[PDB]
Symmetry: D2
Subunit: 115 residues, 4 copies
């Protein structure tokens, strides 16, 4: 129910080995760690959560763009790319969070389907 896809605009390739941390807002308004993982050779990160566990809430998907670029030897601008959204508030949906990275810019979009 939650997938992350990351592309590299400098290389024209998937962004491989990008760390991604997902948080969910708790009742006390703090960000609780929810799931994390790394993008594969295809730039995709599957297996973050399950439909049972991915309940309604406000989620933050933090894509660790600085760590990605630094591991490539590049000094980038941003610390991370964040995507913050309410999920599953009209029932379960499947969400793909996609991002396109450059050293001084990024883009993100959501692809949401109803099973």
């Amino acid at each position: 129910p939650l997938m992350v896809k990351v592309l590299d605009a400098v290389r024209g390739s998937p962004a491989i080995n990008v760390a991604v941390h997902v948080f969910r807002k708790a009742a006390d308004d703090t960000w609780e760690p929810f799931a994390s993982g790394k993008t594969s050779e295809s730039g995709e990160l599957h297996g973050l959560t399950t439909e049972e566990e991915f309940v309604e809430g406000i989620y933050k998907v933090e894509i660790d763009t600085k760590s990605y670029w630094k591991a490539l030897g590049i000094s980038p601008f941003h610390e991370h790319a964040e995507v913050v959204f309410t999920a599953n508030d009209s029932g379960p949906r499947r969400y793909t969070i996609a991002a396109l990275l450059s050293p001084y810019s990024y883009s993100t979009t959501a692809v949401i389907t109803n099973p």
Copy 2:
């Protein structure tokens, strides 16, 4: 060897039924029709060409964004989104041309892999 993927930034969905025309620059410098098709329910267009037919050359992938938005009843800014590039000049590659559409904006990127 050539796939096109189109996403809709207003709907948060694949862009379905987007017409795409591919041209290849001829020896006389005109744009020759090369292949065409429509995106599926997943926003993807497969089957445009073959590795035999997709020789070296300068290609133009024209994504018919105005026709897409007009079919949704929206008056958009652009006539189309174009992506013009040299392909297969260091041997065969597989190209994905991706685009993200809004009524007054679009983004495009390339994902290129070597089989």
Copy 3:
């Protein structure tokens, strides 16, 4: 003068007017301390946030209230807000423009840093 925020609307092809923007500075304890705020003008710009003396090196977060923007236009948006988190570095150029391009299910951001 050292920091400007510019916000554009990809749906209407216009500046994003009267958008609330909050800037925070990361404190030593990793919390986000309020730093400056305002609303974008008719040109989508927010000037006068800080001065050279106040804008020291460090990590800053620019939060753009995209949800209220879209709702005021009668549009249901995906994101709670847009975030741009970056490091200010004195060894680079001296004026930072943080630009954002908004759609309901997507946003893009870039840095335009000049002397």
Copy 4:
């Protein structure tokens, strides 16, 4: 005054300086007639392309010479050029800014139309 082009560099976080830009008007026979051209300034902007009297309704193409830009910086780019093709419509607002954000394998463009 009715038409301005602004070009930004997503790799360096800067304006895209000294980029050649050619504007064409679609003729009655569907060919592209030269209309105006220039090179972007230190701010990434190209002003003075046309006047109100000259800029009539019709379809225009703005070609940005991204390939030369990247090569002058020592970077191998994907695209031959970037294109932005749109209709000028008198029933909408009166000043058009065509903005482009460049990366080696990707570009984004938006319209900022104001009165």
